[PDB]
Structure formats: structure tokens, C-alpha cells
Ligand binder design. Structure first.
Ligand SMILES: NC(=O)c1ccc[n+]([C@@H]2O[C@H](COP(=O)([O-])OP(=O)(O)OC[C@H]3O[C@@H](n4cnc5c(N)ncnc54)[C@H](OP(=O)(O)O)[C@@H]3O)[C@@H](O)[C@H]2O)c1
Lengths: 412, 416
């Protein structure tokens, strides 16, 4: 795989000097060619879907790994959308004249070669390819074993487009082979790859030597204060849970203040049965919600630290804001945390004392997305504290360097 | 070390919840105490320098270890200047209003617990402690073998100041034992320290990166190349080179390879040989420049292959003749450590191309490579020079020790 890495390095060197207009024309060209050769992609997708169905995968997984012609049309659409974004490469961050007559400035530059790992997601292939092409970063894709044929066809089409536009063919590469030893090798190219996006986390945590920007699992907690409007809080909770539960930013643990719980829990159950989410409630929550129409069961200790990714929820009663903060600190994964309240001091304390990647006040937790934050598109959501945090846009894939201009200046 | 880490975390929470006035008070008291207790620090440093010289320490190494009253006043002034800096905690990076009506913004926050493993140097401890206190982080320091008594005195003074100010005693901690097993255990303890800063040579960096479970901002070694173009002033280039090399050769931002164009090599090489002979710099010249530098007064010797990829840390320089700007760029890319690179030229196009095509942490045009320092770059003080690409790069100031957090405010806003 050394040859592939050296090809990616050369491609990054060539791409770092490109112009914004050339990148936009390239993006439009690849979108056009993807639209043109839709039938070839669809045939491979149908074959892969038939193979997966023969393997016994569920209907939901089969739909997820499938691709309709409408889906590829949408892929062309968001590629064209990223074509219209603002290029952050070369932009000046800050600068000034020093005391010794030296003019300093900081300039944004491409991060180099980016290796991303995913599984059973066909659209993310084209999405990450376009996003790295816009920034001028050579990308190495880890296509899933399930959809190897579709990913191979897509990367072949993109490479054909790049050759048509004259760009080096090594800008975008993919490893179709599903061998785990190759995965370890990719996890152990420090000198070549400069940054890794794992979209599984434990494996790279143990083995990786390249700096890793993790995505991580997300258990988002919502705290309900004693003074709040019942109907609006219920609507916010329903939007946070009912709409697309499979997303990693959905709420999982709901914290209800002790004082308001007596009134909140009955209406919560009344709306909850209509929404139809199972309530893994605590002991006191069980006692209060037993009369409720919504189905409710006891909660186990390990359920608080794991995301259901389904129509399930956890109900816990806390004494006050300090108890909720302690619980969030102990069990939270630092992904998203929101508070519904009508007190200014409580909101200020919650904002100051919580160290999540995104804190909301009287808002849903479903806004932790690249599109909602106005970043155009995102590659992943980072829960670490280094480099980018939260949704990662274009500027998250660029580093900076210092440039100093003088006239034979010497330090004194 | 588990109790050390838990104390660090407990102190870090309160430090992140503190205000700017208290941190400024702590820093001012630290500076005043350091000025008051100069005699003990000076005596300890003198004893340590004498002991190290008794073990045949290098002159540059001794100079790095040596601390004068002027240097103590300088570190006190640096502490005060850091105290005068604006607090980067709570500052807003950007914000706006979304379509859905969600007022969004980004705010700076402390990183948490910071571990640092530095070389044998007395001032780096004070600067690291001051920066971590100003930023609201808790710091665990592991010093070198030589700086034992000076580091003990400095950490005692800092802890006394923290106790006097009423801040939690776990904010700043240091490990006295020079055993490397403790270093390995610090490396393996992840859930407690949030970021590790190693300062040293290749061996330490390799050791941590082999057994690291924490994010690491490598200090890295410095091989700084200076490229001389065809059209350039000989005297000014010689002065810049002399300033880059002669002044403090023990640093990590000192030029180690001199790239000379063929066209200018006819005239630049002789005069250079005269200049370095004044400074006693030994010239490790390539085969092409060996004939030209043979008649020069300065001592000249052939250069081995591995010399291009290692730091001399002495009064030595590598002289190589390159064909053009592209050859120099290729050589810098192949053998450079991405620390600092400078070009001396009188052509605009060459300077622009060199700035564009060189992906180093610092690029200079008609300037020395000795400017790659936290103080010179306008920052109050530096914790380390980062040669990596993730998070901070180049000198690391106050903003390099902070992360950010998104905050959104709305009136029960719902995503559609
Ligand atoms: N990048 C920067 O910002 C920066 C700044 C200053 C200096 N430097 C670099 O500093 C280097 C010279 O430093 P130095 O003279 O102190 O020598 P060094 O060998 O680079 O120092 C290594 C440091 O780590 C410790 N160490 C060494 N081997 C270790 C091991 N196997 N496991 C754990 N710890 C280990 C050393 O103390 P023990 O030997 O007692 O373990 C010392 O504190 C230069 O190459 C220069 O580039 C870089």
C-alpha cells in the first residue's frame, strides 16, 4: 500500500496549488458524469442489494445500502451545491507588523492526505470525495465490505472524471479489498497519512498512530427545569425523538426536575403514547408513569451509557440543576445537551458549567448538523477537544502556517 | 499517579469556573515571589550547572542550563507580560442567526488537564505554569534529569503562591522521580489528562507515540534550511546567516543546512568561508562545494548522508549546492522536519513561489530563522513549538491551549 500512499502524497502536492475556479469546474464535471452513467451505477447497486438480501440482511439495512436513481440525482444535486460554497484555502486569518520591522501573517493551507473509514453508506463516498476535492485534500476511502462493488464503480467514475479534467488520478483512492490486515496497515501509516476520520472507534484508539478525529457515540441529555411551559417542552421533546431516531444526535436521556415532575410526567406520558416510544424509566419515574397510557418499563444501569438508536427513552428524576450537571458529567459522551427552562440564572449556569460539544437553551438537540449550522456540508461530528469540535465544515479540513516578510531583519 | 490526576481534574473544574481577576492576582503574586526569592533559585541553578559541568556537559548545553540574574529578571518580565495579556477564556469567535431563528455562537473554553514533559531547562517550568494558570488549565509537569533542584524550588514557590491565593492546590503538580516508568504510566493514563505536550528529541517522541493513548502535540526536532537565491546582497545574507547560526546555537530553530544556488556559488562561497572563520563555524560541505571551500580559512569537512537529517546543536553548518528553486524545494521537502524555512532573494516571483510551495510551520523571506519564538511572534510566551498539523502549529500561545464550544439560544425552536 506504500505505492498508493506515495501517489496520494504526490496528488496532494499537485492539488494544493490549484485554483478555486478549477476545483469548481472539476466538481461540476464529476456531477455531470455521475448523472450520465447512472445506469452502470444502478446495475451494480441492484446486484449488491440482491446479494445482501441473499445474505439475510434486514429490510432497513437493505434500504440503507440501496440506491435509487432519485438518490443518485440527489447526489448530483448536493455535489453541485458544494460547488457553490466559498473556498477557505488561502484566506488570511490574522497578522500585523512586529516591533522589529517584520510583517507576520497566518494563511490557511490544505491539511494534506485524509483517510476516512466508513461502512454501508453509499452517499458518503461522493460526499467526502467532493468535500475533500473542494479543500484540495487527497482522500483515501475505506469502502465497506457490503457495498464494495458500488464504491469501486463510483471511485472509478470519479477517477475517470479527474483524468478528463487533467487532474492527477491519485487524488481520490479507495481500497476495495475487505482484508482486516489492510485496515491495520492503513491505521499504521503515520508518515504518509496526516489525518484520519473514523465514522470501530476502539480499534483505531488502540492501533492508530496518525492523529485521529473521532466521531464517537452520542448520548444526548435534555434537562427539564421546574419552571417551563408543558406544551412547548413536549413539542421540543417529540421533535428531538420522533424525527429520525437513527441519527446519532437524537436525545436518549431525559432529566426531569423533581419539583415539576409530578405535573410533567402525566402529560408527558399522554403525548408519549401517541408518539409511541418505549419509556425505560427510573424507579420514581416508574411509580409516577405506571398509570400512564404509554408503555413503560424499568431501566438498567448500563442503559444510561448506551444509545438505543430506536424508539426508546430514559426517564430519570434529579433533585436540582447540580444533580443534573453531575449526571451529565459522569455519563455524558459530550455530544449535545439542551435545557428547557424559563429562568435566566439557571440557563447561564447550565451554559457555563457544561462542557459538551453543543449546548442549547430552549431548543431541540437535532440541530447538531452541518447543514443546520450553516457550514454547507459536514464529514462527521467530532466529540474530542482537539482541532475541530462539533460539526466539521470546510475550515475544519485546513491548517494554518505563519509567513513572515522582512528586509534582512535579524533578531536582537 | 491516580490521586495526582484526580486532584488535577478537581482543580481543573474550579479553574475553568474562575474569573480573570483572580488569575491575574495569582500571576502577579507569582512574579513578585519569584523576584523576592531570586537568591535561592540562583544558588540552586549555579550548583546544578557546576554539577553538570562536572559530568562534561557541552558548552551550549551548559548555556541552556545556565541561568543569570538577567535571565531571572527576563522570566519575571515574561510572567508580567503574560499577566497583562487579555484573557482568551469566554471570548466569542463568531456567531449569527439561522433561518429557523436559532441565535448561534462559538465560545472559547479551557482544554482541561494538560501534561507536559520538557527538557532540562528552568524557565520553561515557570512559563508553562503561568500559561496554564492564565488559561484555566491544570498542569502536570515532568522535568528533565538535570533540572532537579531548580525545578523543585520553582514548583515550591508556585505551590506556595497558589495556596496563598486560595486556589486549589492540585492546579499545578510536578513529578520529582526521574524514572521513565512513571513517564510510561503518565503516557498510558488517558481518561485523566486531556492533552500531552512532549518537548525533546526523536527518542522521547518515538517513545510516547509508540505508547500514547492521549492526544499529543509533538514539539519535534528542528532542521531549519536557509535557501540563497541567485540575486541577493552578499553582505546582508552573510549577516542574516551569522545571526541565525552564531546566536544561541543550542536552540531548535537554528539553521542547520545552507542551500546555495550554483550561479551565486562562485561568489558567495569564498566570502562565506571568510565570515564563518571569524565565528569558528565548521563547514560540513558537500562534494561540489568542497573544492570551493577548500581554500577558505574556515575549517571544512566532507558531509555524511545522515548529517542532513540530524541537528548539529553546535557551531556547525551544512553547505549544499542546488540547481534551482525547484531542487531546493525538493530537498527541503525530503529532508526537512517542517519547523522553519527562510529564503534570501531579490526576485519577487521566486519569493512568492517559495512561500506558496513550502508547507513548513514558518516561512521567512529575507529574514532569519531565529524569529520562530513565542515572544517574538507577538504572543506573551510559548509552551512549545508544534511541528504537526493538527490543532496548533508553530509557536503555541494562549489561544493554542483553548478549544471552542457551540451555544444556541431559541424560543422552543424545532427543526423542520
Ligand atoms: N520543538 C520544540 O519546541 C523544542 C524546544 C526545545 C528543545 N527542543 C529539542 O530538544 C532537543 C534536545 O533536548 P535535550 O538536550 O533535553 O535532549 P533530549 O534527549 O531531546 O531530551 C529528552 C527529554 O525527555 C526525557 N527523555 C529522554 N529519553 C526518554 C525516554 N526514553 N523516555 C522518557 N523520557 C525520556 C529527557 O529526560 P531524561 O533523559 O532524564 O529521561 C528529557 O527531558 C533538540 O533536539 C531540540 O530540537 C525542541
Amino acid at each position: 500500500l506504500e505505492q498508493m500512499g506515495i501517489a496520494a502524497k504526490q496528488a496532494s502536492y499537485k492539488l494544493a496549488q490549484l485554483s478555486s475556479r478549477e476545483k469548481n469546474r472539476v466538481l461540476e464535471k464529476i456531477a455531470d458524469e455521475l448523472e450520465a452513467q447512472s445506469e452502470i451505477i444502478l446495475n451494480a447497486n441492484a446486484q449488491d442489494v440482491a446479494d445482501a438480501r441473499a445474505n439475510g440482511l434486514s429490510e432497513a439495512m437493505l434500504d440503507r445500502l440501496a440506491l435509487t436513481p432519485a438518490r443518485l440525482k440527489g447526489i448530483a444535486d448536493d455535489v453541485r451545491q458544494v460547488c457553490n460554497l466559498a473556498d477557505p484555502v488561502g484566506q488570511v486569518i490574522d497578522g500585523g507588523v512586529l516591533d522589529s520591522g517584520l510583517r507576520l501573517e497566518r494563511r490557511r493551507v490544505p491539511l494534506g492526505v485524509i483517510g476516512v473509514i466508513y461502512e454501508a453508506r453509499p452517499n458518503v463516498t461522493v460526499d467526502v470525495a467532493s468535500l475533500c476535492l473542494k479543500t484540495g485534500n487527497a482522500v483515501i476511502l475505506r469502502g465497506g465490505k457490503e457495498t464494495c462493488r458500488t464504491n469501486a464503480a463510483t471511485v472509478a467514475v470519479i477517477q475517470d472524471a479527474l483524468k478528463s479534467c487533467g487532474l492527477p488520478a491519485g487524488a481520490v483512492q479507495a481500497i476495495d479489498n475487505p482484508d482486516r490486515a489492510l485496515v491495520s496497515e492503513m491505521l499504521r501509516m503515520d508518515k504518509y497519512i496526516d489525518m484520519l476520520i473514523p465514522r470501530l472507534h476502539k480499534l483505531c484508539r488502540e492501533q492508530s498512530t496518525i492523529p485521529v478525529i473521532t466521531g464517537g457515540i452520542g448520548v444526548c441529555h435534555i434537562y427539564v427545569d421546574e419552571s417551563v411551559e408543558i406544551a412547548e417542552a413536549l413539542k421540543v421533546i417529540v421533535n428531538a425523538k420522533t424525527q429520525r431516531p437513527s441519527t446519532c444526535n437524537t436525545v436518549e436521556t431525559l432529566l426531569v426536575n423533581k419539583n415539576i415532575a409530578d405535573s410533567f410526567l402525566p402529560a408527558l406520558s399522554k403525548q408519549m403514547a401517541e408518539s409511541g416510544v418505549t419509556l425505560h424509566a427510573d424507579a420514581a419515574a416508574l411509580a409516577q408513569l405506571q398509570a400512564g397510557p404509554a408503555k413503560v418499563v424499568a431501566v438498567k444501569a448500563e442503559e444510561y451509557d448506551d444509545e438505543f438508536l430506536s424508539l426508546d427513552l430514559n426517564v430519570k428524576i434529579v433533585s436540582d440543576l447540580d444533580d443534573a450537571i453531575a449526571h451529565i458529567r459522569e455519563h455524558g459522551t459530550q455530544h449535545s445537551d439542551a435545557i428547557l427552562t424559563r429562568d435566566m440564572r439557571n440557563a447561564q449556569r447550565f451554559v457555563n458549567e457544561v462542557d459538551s460539544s453543543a449546548v442549547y437553551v430552549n431548543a431541540s438537540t437535532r440541530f447538531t448538523d452541518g447543514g443546520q449550522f450553516g457550514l454547507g456540508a459536514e464529514v462527521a461530528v467530532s466529540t474530542q477537544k482537539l482541532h475541530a469540535r462539533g460539526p466539521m465544515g470546510l475550515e475544519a479540513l485546513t491548517t494554518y502556517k505563519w509567513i513572515g516578510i522582512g528586509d534582512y531583519t535579524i533578531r536582537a
